[PDB]
Design a protein around this ligand. Structure first.
Ligand SMILES: O=c1ccn([C@H]2C[C@H](O)[C@@H](COP(=O)(O)NP(=O)(O)O)O2)c(=O)[nH]1
Ligand SMILES: O=c1ccn([C@H]2C[C@H](O)[C@@H](COP(=O)(O)NP(=O)(O)O)O2)c(=O)[nH]1
Ligand SMILES: [Mg+2]
Ligand SMILES: [Mg+2]
Ligand SMILES: [Mg+2]
Ligand SMILES: [Mg+2]
Ligand SMILES: [Mg+2]
Ligand SMILES: [Mg+2]
Lengths: 226, 209
């Protein structure tokens, strides 16, 4: 698959998931149940989850190491919401055009190369990069291009590349569907499965498996034992 | 009590807590263990907790109602960090706070509006260039909308300040503290105690976690 094909595939997956979650024409700003959609708030709330994957608190668990497994999950959650904002921001949707525009972001090319492992000395800078995303998404707006650039730069610093993002995205997209199919809206969903959060179980599954439908089935099996 | 006394007391309690937690001269930006302090980050992270006290998500638990108990706790957590910024004597600081026009009103629904005020605080705490005075006004405007007044802030602040000391005395720093006590977050147990010396209750309660 070309870089643009990978991006088109994620956009198409995001569209389908949003359509199923929110109803058609969620792009107009509300779900079918009348709830306001704020993709920017979604993003800065995942940014808070991302920050909490690091030992940023000066008063709590100060010798603990970075949770890099969760870092990757939160980077992927952010991406779901950025894809959503791309689709919202814009009858006939041209996914290839959108993909082509994302592909032209200067740092995207760098994102497509092999990932580098981060280390403790990178955390200060990573936290400041996340803070910039929070700032951009909490104001008036807002520039979608600067957001993409800042996002890919952050994702590189966090040890992701397009490959890791894509494969993890697919898995989380499946879990997102699973959640909606199992009581996420009405509060009946159990997010902890025999002591592990669903994201952690998904990560275990992803160590082996990439196939969309196989992932769903495996989630189903594990959730029976939740 | 007068408003100035209430403010001075909070500022005094904050200094004590920060001294005990971080060591003397935390005002220079580092803890005794050499960790960099960012009060603004502390604030926007509590803002996230505050947002999460409302049914903001369009895709999850969409019929749930606001957790006003937790709203009060997060408004109080934000206040600890604002006091820390103010401090980063007490009479003069209290005098400035008391002069904030919205503060006077504070001494006396619309969830998406509340959320927008929280968002403004997040925005102000995450940019390059910061104004503490403007944050104060936004904060008290929000706290009114959340149903607090000075009395509620002050009484809840005292209680959480006690929990904060308790935490530090019981392994918060080294990861041995249990933050969930027999199925309830420590903040929820605190809230139950505050319906009703606080430190002794916490210590007794902590025994069965
Ligand atoms: O309209 C929506 C709403 C949610 N999500 C997904 C994206 C993200 O992957 C996830 C975040 O769900 P959450 O409820 O914040 N839980 P967690 O952050 O632990 O995944 O929800 C969408 O893709 N579209
Ligand atoms: O230097 C510090 C560090 C922390 N805190 C307090 C303020 C706040 O009340 C609490 C927040 O701690 P937390 O670990 O974020 N946990 P929670 O938000 O659940 O109370 O910590 C201070 O007062 N000073
Ligand atoms: Mg989330
Ligand atoms: Mg998370
Ligand atoms: Mg997340
Ligand atoms: Mg907190
Ligand atoms: Mg909280
Ligand atoms: Mg809090």
């Amino acid at each position: 698959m070309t870089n643009i094909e990978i991006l088109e595939n994620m956009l198409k997956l995001q569209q389908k998931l949003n359509d199923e979650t929110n109803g058609l024409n969620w792009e107009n700003g509300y779900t079918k149940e009348g709830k306001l959609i704020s993709w920017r708030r979604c993003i800065y709330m995942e940014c808070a989850e991302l920050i909490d994957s690091f030992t940023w608190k000066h008063w709590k668990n100060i010798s603990s190491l970075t949770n890099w497994e969760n870092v990757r999950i939160e980077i992927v959650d952010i991406w779901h919401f950025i894809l959503s904002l791309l689709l919202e921001e814009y009858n006939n949707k041209d996914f290839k055009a959108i993909a082509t525009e994302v592909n032209a972001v200067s740092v995207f090319q760098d994102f497509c190369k092999e990932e580098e492992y981060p280390n403790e000395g990178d955390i200060y800078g990573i936290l400041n990069d996340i803070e910039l995303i929070i700032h951009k998404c909490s104001g008036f707006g807002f520039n979608l291009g600067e957001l993409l650039s800042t996002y890919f730069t952050l994702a590189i610093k966090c040890g992701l590349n397009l490959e890791i993002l894509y494969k993890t995205y697919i898995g989380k997209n499946v879990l997102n569907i699973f959640r909606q199919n199992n009581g996420y809206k009405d509060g009946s969903y159990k997010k902890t499965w025999n002591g592990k959060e669903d994201n952690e179980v998904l990560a275990q599954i992803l160590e082996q498996e990439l196939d969309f439908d196989t992932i769903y089935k495996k989630l189903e099996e594990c959730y029976k034992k939740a």
